[PDB]
Design a protein around this ligand. Sequence first.
Ligand SMILES: CCCCCCCCO[C@@H]1O[C@H](CO)[C@@H](O)[C@H](O)[C@H]1O
Ligand SMILES: CCCCCCCCO[C@@H]1O[C@H](CO)[C@@H](O)[C@H](O)[C@H]1O
Ligand SMILES: CCCCCCCCO[C@@H]1O[C@H](CO)[C@@H](O)[C@H](O)[C@H]1O
Ligand SMILES: CCCCCCCCO[C@@H]1O[C@H](CO)[C@@H](O)[C@H](O)[C@H]1O
Ligand SMILES: CCCCCCCCO[C@@H]1O[C@H](CO)[C@@H](O)[C@H](O)[C@H]1O
Ligand SMILES: CCCCCCCCO[C@@H]1O[C@H](CO)[C@@H](O)[C@H](O)[C@H]1O
Ligand SMILES: CCCCCCCCO[C@@H]1O[C@H](CO)[C@@H](O)[C@H](O)[C@H]1O
Ligand SMILES: CCCCCCCCO[C@@H]1O[C@H](CO)[C@@H](O)[C@H](O)[C@H]1O
Ligand SMILES: CCCCCCCCO[C@@H]1O[C@H](CO)[C@@H](O)[C@H](O)[C@H]1O
Ligand SMILES: CCCCCCCCO[C@@H]1O[C@H](CO)[C@@H](O)[C@H](O)[C@H]1O
Ligand SMILES: CCCCCCCCO[C@@H]1O[C@H](CO)[C@@H](O)[C@H](O)[C@H]1O
Ligand SMILES: CCCCCCCCO[C@@H]1O[C@H](CO)[C@@H](O)[C@H](O)[C@H]1O
Ligand SMILES: CCCCCCCCO[C@@H]1O[C@H](CO)[C@@H](O)[C@H](O)[C@H]1O
Ligand SMILES: CCCCCCCCO[C@@H]1O[C@H](CO)[C@@H](O)[C@H](O)[C@H]1O
Ligand SMILES: CCCCCCCCO[C@@H]1O[C@H](CO)[C@@H](O)[C@H](O)[C@H]1O
Ligand SMILES: CCCCCCCCO[C@@H]1O[C@H](CO)[C@@H](O)[C@H](O)[C@H]1O
Ligand SMILES: [Cl-]
Ligand SMILES: [Cl-]
Ligand SMILES: [Cl-]
Ligand SMILES: [Cl-]
Ligand SMILES: [Cl-]
Lengths: 263, 263, 263, 263
Amino acid sequence: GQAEIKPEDAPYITNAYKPAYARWGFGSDSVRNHFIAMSGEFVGTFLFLWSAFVIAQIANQAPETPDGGSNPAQLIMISFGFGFGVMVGVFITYRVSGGNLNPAVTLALVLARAIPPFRGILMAFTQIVAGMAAAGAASAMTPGEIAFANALGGGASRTRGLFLEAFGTAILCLTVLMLAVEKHRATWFAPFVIGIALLIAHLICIYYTGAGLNPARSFGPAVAARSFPNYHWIYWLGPILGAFLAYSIWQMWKWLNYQTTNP
Amino acid sequence: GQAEIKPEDAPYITNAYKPAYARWGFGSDSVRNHFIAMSGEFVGTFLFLWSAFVIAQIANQAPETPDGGSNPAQLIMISFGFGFGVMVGVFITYRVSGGNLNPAVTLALVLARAIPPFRGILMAFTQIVAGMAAAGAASAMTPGEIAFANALGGGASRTRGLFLEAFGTAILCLTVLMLAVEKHRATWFAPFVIGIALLIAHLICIYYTGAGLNPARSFGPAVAARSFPNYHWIYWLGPILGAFLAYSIWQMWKWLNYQTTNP
Amino acid sequence: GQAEIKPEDAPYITNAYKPAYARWGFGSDSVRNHFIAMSGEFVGTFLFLWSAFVIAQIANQAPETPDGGSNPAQLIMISFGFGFGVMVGVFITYRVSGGNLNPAVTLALVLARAIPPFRGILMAFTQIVAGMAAAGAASAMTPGEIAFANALGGGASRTRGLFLEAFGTAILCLTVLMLAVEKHRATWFAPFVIGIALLIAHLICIYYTGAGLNPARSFGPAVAARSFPNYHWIYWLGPILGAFLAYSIWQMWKWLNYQTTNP
Amino acid sequence: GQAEIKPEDAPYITNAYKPAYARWGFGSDSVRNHFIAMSGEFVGTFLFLWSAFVIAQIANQAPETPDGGSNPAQLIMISFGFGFGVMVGVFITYRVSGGNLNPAVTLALVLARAIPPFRGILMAFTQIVAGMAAAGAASAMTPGEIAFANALGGGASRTRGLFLEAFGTAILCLTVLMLAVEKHRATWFAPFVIGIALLIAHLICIYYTGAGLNPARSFGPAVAARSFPNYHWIYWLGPILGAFLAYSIWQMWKWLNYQTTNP
Ligand SMILES: CCCCCCCCO[C@@H]1O[C@H](CO)[C@@H](O)[C@H](O)[C@H]1O
Ligand SMILES: CCCCCCCCO[C@@H]1O[C@H](CO)[C@@H](O)[C@H](O)[C@H]1O
Ligand SMILES: CCCCCCCCO[C@@H]1O[C@H](CO)[C@@H](O)[C@H](O)[C@H]1O
Ligand SMILES: CCCCCCCCO[C@@H]1O[C@H](CO)[C@@H](O)[C@H](O)[C@H]1O
Ligand SMILES: CCCCCCCCO[C@@H]1O[C@H](CO)[C@@H](O)[C@H](O)[C@H]1O
Ligand SMILES: CCCCCCCCO[C@@H]1O[C@H](CO)[C@@H](O)[C@H](O)[C@H]1O
Ligand SMILES: CCCCCCCCO[C@@H]1O[C@H](CO)[C@@H](O)[C@H](O)[C@H]1O
Ligand SMILES: CCCCCCCCO[C@@H]1O[C@H](CO)[C@@H](O)[C@H](O)[C@H]1O
Ligand SMILES: CCCCCCCCO[C@@H]1O[C@H](CO)[C@@H](O)[C@H](O)[C@H]1O
Ligand SMILES: CCCCCCCCO[C@@H]1O[C@H](CO)[C@@H](O)[C@H](O)[C@H]1O
Ligand SMILES: CCCCCCCCO[C@@H]1O[C@H](CO)[C@@H](O)[C@H](O)[C@H]1O
Ligand SMILES: CCCCCCCCO[C@@H]1O[C@H](CO)[C@@H](O)[C@H](O)[C@H]1O
Ligand SMILES: CCCCCCCCO[C@@H]1O[C@H](CO)[C@@H](O)[C@H](O)[C@H]1O
Ligand SMILES: CCCCCCCCO[C@@H]1O[C@H](CO)[C@@H](O)[C@H](O)[C@H]1O
Ligand SMILES: CCCCCCCCO[C@@H]1O[C@H](CO)[C@@H](O)[C@H](O)[C@H]1O
Ligand SMILES: CCCCCCCCO[C@@H]1O[C@H](CO)[C@@H](O)[C@H](O)[C@H]1O
Ligand SMILES: [Cl-]
Ligand SMILES: [Cl-]
Ligand SMILES: [Cl-]
Ligand SMILES: [Cl-]
Ligand SMILES: [Cl-]
C-alpha cells in the first residue's frame, strides 16, 4: 500500500519548496536572517530588473510604428522580459527571501501579516536599491539613450494609467496571495503563476503606461535617466492601490474560510 | 523506507489543490457557500476578461494588414491575453469556485453532474455580470472605440463561424473534464492545461469569429458597444454545442471505465 | 513524521497520471480495451490536427515575405498550433490511449516494446483516419485554398528535408521515450515536454519542409487537397528513421542501466 | 490518514526525477559510468544545439531591419530555439548526465563540488565536440551561408558584450544551482526553469552579442564557418565569469544556511 523512498531521495520530499516567509517564525529577527532576506531580494530584484531592462532596451530599437499604433511582437518581447524575468528571479530566491522583488507585493504580504512590517520595510528598501543598481547597470551596458523608463503612451490619460496600474498590480498581488501565501499542493509552483500574472499585466500596461506595476521598477530608470515625469506618482499610488485591492479580496475569502465547505 | 514530513510542511501535503466543486457535498447549499462560489466566479471572470479585453484593445491598434490578410503577432498577443488570462484567473479561484469563468464550461460540468443545476445557474449569471463589468471597465480605461467585441472576419461565413466556435469550445470543455473533473495526480495542474486549451482555441478562432468560446465574453462587449450583430447567436449556440460535444466524449469514456484495464 | 491525507483527497494520490500503455497488461486484448485505445487516438489526433490545421491556414494568410525570406511571427504561430495542440491532445488522452497521436511515436513505442505490434497497428490506422478527418474538417470550415499541406520551401532539397524530418522526429520520439515510457516522478508531466519538443521541431522544419514529423499529419491534407508531391515519401521515411534513431538511443541507455550508478 | 499506492504505480514515486550528478557517489568512476555521462552530454548537447542552430538559420532569413533596428519576432524565435531547445535536451538527459549541455554550467557545478573535476573535464570536452558536430550538421542541412555564428551587433562594444555574456550566464548557472543542485520538492522541475533562464538570457544577448552563454555553442559554428572574430574570447571569458559569479552567490547562501531559520 506504500511506495518506498530510498534514503538518498528523502531530501526531495522532506525539503519543501516553499517561500521563505512561510517559515519566518521565532528566531527570524537575527541579523543573519535579516541579511539572508535582504540578499535574496537584492539578487532576485537585480537579476529580474536588469534582464528586463536590457530586453526592453532592445525591443524599443524596433522601427517606429506609424500613427501611434501598437507593435504586438515588441509588446510580447517586453512582456516576456518582465514575466519570465520575474519567474526566474522568484524560482531562484523562493527559499531565500520568498522572491517578492516588488515593494507592492511586499506591501500586500505585510497587510496579510505574512511578513512583519520591519522586515517588510527592509525588503522594500532593498528592492528599490536593487532597481537603481539594475537601471544603472542596464544603462552602462547598452548603447543609445535609456529606452526602459516608464512613460504614458497610446493616448492614455494619467487617470486611465493609474487604474490600469492598480488593476494590473492587483492581479499580481492576488496571485502571490492565493498561490504562495496560501498553503497547499500548488504552493511550490507559485513562481510560475506569478510570472504569468506579470506577463499578462505587461500586455495590459506597456502600451499605455510603460508598465510600472512595481515602484522599484519605475524609480530606478527615472534616477538613471535623471528624469521624473510629473505623473510619476501613478507608479507609486497605482501599485499601492492594487496591493490593497488584492489584500481586500484575499481577506474576504479568509474571513469566509473559502477553502472549506463546512467550517 | 519513508521520508519525514516536518509538521510545518504538512499543509503543503494535506491541503489538496483541487477545484472547489470537487468538495461541494453536504453543507454546500448554505448562503455562505453560494456566496463563496459566486465571489470566485465574479473575481476570476472579471480579472480574466478585463485583462484580455484591454490586451485585445491594444493588439487591435496595430497597423491594418492589407487585403484582409492575417497578422500572426497580433493574433498571438490576443491569444496570450485570453489563454494566460484565464490561466491566472483559474489558478487564483480554483479552490474558491473551481474557476469555470465561462457559462459553457459550467454547462459541461452541470451535464457531467460535477456541479448541480441551481449552483450552475448562479455561477453562469455571475459570469455574465462579470463580463459586462469587465467590458465596461475596459472601455472606460482605454482610449478610442471598443475593439474587443466579437465579429466575423477573414472571409468566414456564419455557418463556418458556428462550427469553429463549437469545436474550439469542445476542446476547452474536454480539457476541464479530463484534467479538473477527473481525479488524479495531475488535477492540481489543470489550470495550466485549461489556459493552453483556450490559447489554442483563440489561435483557431480570432481571425474568423473574434473568438467567443464563452457567452459571457461575447455578451459583455456587445452591451458596452451597444451593438449586437444579427449573427450574435453563434456565440451562444456554438459554445453550447461545444459543451455538449465535450460532455458526450467524456460520458462515453466514463461508461467505458476508460482508466482501468480490467474493471 | 507523516502528513495526513483526507479520505476525499486520496484519489489525487492513488490515481496515477500515467500513459495508458503503462498499464496494458493481461486483459488488454479485449474488444473494449482496443476500442478505448482507438477512441483516445481518434479524439486526440483529430482535435490536435484539426486545431493545428486551422491555425496554419490562418497563419498562411499573412502577406507574402519578399525574396523567399522567413516570417518569424508566422512560424511561431504555426509552431504553437502544433506544439500546444499536441500538448492539449496528449494531456486529454494520456489515461485513455497514452496520447501518441502520431504513427512515428507509436512505431518508436512498438520498437521499445511499450506497445504490442497489433495494438500499435490499430493505433496507427486510427491516427491516419483521424488526420484525414481533421484535414477534411479544416478544409470545410475555412475559406480559400488549403494552405496547411506539407511542401518543401526555403530552398531546401528533398535530401535536406528528409534529414530535417528525421532529426526533428527523433527529438519528439526520444522525449516520449525518456519522459512518458520511463517511469519516474516526472512521467505525469510528459505531455508538456512532448508539446515543447514538437514546438521546437516545427521551428526547425516548417520553413523547409512544412514540418511533417507525423505521417498522419502529412497524409490527411494531401488527400483533402487531392495533391501528393512526388517527394511525399520524405514525410514517411523521415519520421520512420527518426523513430528508429530515438529508439536506438533509448535502447543503448537501457542496456547501460543509465539511471543507476551501481547496477 | 494515508492514501494507497498501487504496486504498479510505485515506480512513479520511488524513482526520483533528479539530475544524475546527485547520485554520482562511490562506484561512479567506472568506464561504464563515465560513458553514460558522456553519452548524455553528447546526445543532449547535439540535439539542443543542432535544433537551435537550424532555428537561428531560419530566423536570420527574415528581411533586414533598416537602420540597425531590432526585430522582436526574430529575437523571440531564436530565444525559443535555444530556451526550449535546452529545456527539451535537459529533460531528456536529466537522469543520464544531469543535462549540463554547457561547459560554463559544468564549471559552476565543479566549483560547487556537485561534479568532480575529471568528470567535469570529460563532460566539457564532450559538449564542445557535440557543438562542433551540431554546427557541421546544421550547416550541411540548410541552404545559404551559416547565419548562426556569434557576432557583436546592435552597436555593442566588446566590453559591453563581455558583461552581457557574463551576467546572462550567471542567471543560467544560478538557476541550475538553486533548482537542480539544491535538493527540494522542485528539483524535478529544474529543466523547465533552466530553459526559461536561457530564453531570457537570449532576449538579453542575441541583439548585442549573438548570445554565446556557452563556449560549446560559440566554438562549433566558428569552426564550421572557418571564421573566428578577434573578440571570440568574450564567449569564453564572459561565461566563465558568469559561472564564478553564480557560484559565489550560491556559496554565500550555503555558508549562511539560507534555507533554515534556526540552524
Ligand atoms: C528556547 C525555547 C524557544 C525556542 C523558540 C522556538 C523555535 C521555533 O522556530 C521555528 O521552528 C519551526 C520548526 O519547529 C520552523 O519551521 C521555523 O522556521 C522556526 O522559526
Ligand atoms: C473600474 C472603473 C474604472 C474607471 C476608470 C475610468 C478613467 C476615466 O478616464 C477618463 O475618461 C474620459 C472619457 O470622457 C476622458 O476624457 C479622460 O481623459 C479619461 O481620464
Ligand atoms: C449580499 C450577499 C450576502 C453575502 C453573504 C455572506 C455570507 C456570510 O456567511 C457567514 O460567514 C461567516 C464567516 O465565514 C460564518 O461565520 C457564518 O457561519 C456564515 O453565516
Ligand atoms: C442542530 C441545529 C442546527 C441548525 C443550523 C443549520 C445550518 C446548516 O448549515 C450548515 O452550518 C454548518 C455549521 O455552521 C456549516 O459548517 C455548513 O457549511 C452549513 O451548511
Ligand atoms: C448531521 C450528520 C450529517 C452531516 C453531513 C455530512 C457532512 C459531509 O460534508 C462533506 O464532508 C467531506 C469530508 O468528510 C468534505 O470533503 C466535503 O467538502 C463536505 O461537503
Ligand atoms: C466537421 C464538419 C464541419 C462542416 C462545416 C462546414 C461548414 C460549411 O461552410 C460552407 O461552405 C460552403 C462551401 O461551398 C460555402 O459556400 C458557405 O458559405 C459556407 O458556409
Ligand atoms: C463499433 C465498435 C465497437 C465498440 C465496442 C464498445 C466496447 C463495449 O465493451 C463493453 O463495455 C461495457 C461498458 O464499459 C462493459 O460493461 C462490457 O464489459 C464491455 O463488453
Ligand atoms: C470464467 C469464464 C470467463 C469468460 C469471460 C472471458 C472474458 C475475458 O475478458 C476480460 O473480462 C474481464 C471481466 O469482464 C475484464 O475485466 C477484462 O478487461 C477482459 O479482458
Ligand atoms: C485468472 C487469473 C489471471 C488474472 C490476470 C491478471 C490480471 C493482471 O492485469 C493487470 O493488473 C494490474 C494490477 O495488478 C493492472 O495495473 C494492469 O492494468 C492489468 O493489466
Ligand atoms: C548529420 C549529417 C546530415 C547530412 C545531411 C546533408 C544533406 C546533403 O544536402 C545536400 O547538400 C549539397 C551541398 O553541396 C546540395 O548541393 C544538395 O542539393 C543537398 O541535397
Ligand atoms: C568506446 C567507448 C567505450 C564504451 C564503454 C561502454 C560501457 C560498457 O560497460 C558495461 O556495460 C554493461 C551493460 O550495462 C555492464 O553489464 C558491464 O558491467 C559494463 O562493464
Ligand atoms: C571483489 C572483486 C571485485 C572486482 C571488480 C571491481 C569493479 C568495480 O566497479 C564497480 O562494479 C560494480 C559491479 O559491477 C558496479 O555496480 C559499479 O558501478 C562499478 O563501479
Ligand atoms: C564494498 C563496500 C563499499 C560499497 C560502496 C558503497 C556504494 C555506495 O554507492 C552509492 O549508493 C547510493 C545508495 O546507497 C546511491 O544513491 C549512489 O548512486 C551510489 O553511488
Ligand atoms: C555592473 C556594471 C557593468 C559595467 C559595464 C560597462 C561597460 C562599459 O561600456 C563602455 O561604455 C562607454 C560609454 O562612454 C563606451 O564609450 C564604450 O565603448 C563601452 O565599452
Ligand atoms: C554588512 C552586512 C552584515 C552581514 C551579516 C552576515 C550574517 C552573518 O551571520 C552569521 O552567519 C554564520 C554563518 O551562517 C553563522 O554561523 C552565525 O551564527 C551568524 O551570526
Ligand atoms: C542561552 C543564551 C543564548 C544567547 C544567544 C541568543 C541568540 C539568539 O539568536 C538565535 O541564535 C540561534 C542559535 O545560533 C539561531 O539558530 C537563531 O536563528 C537565532 O535567532
Ligand atoms: Cl527572533
Ligand atoms: Cl446543504
Ligand atoms: Cl487479454
Ligand atoms: Cl568508483
Ligand atoms: Cl508536481
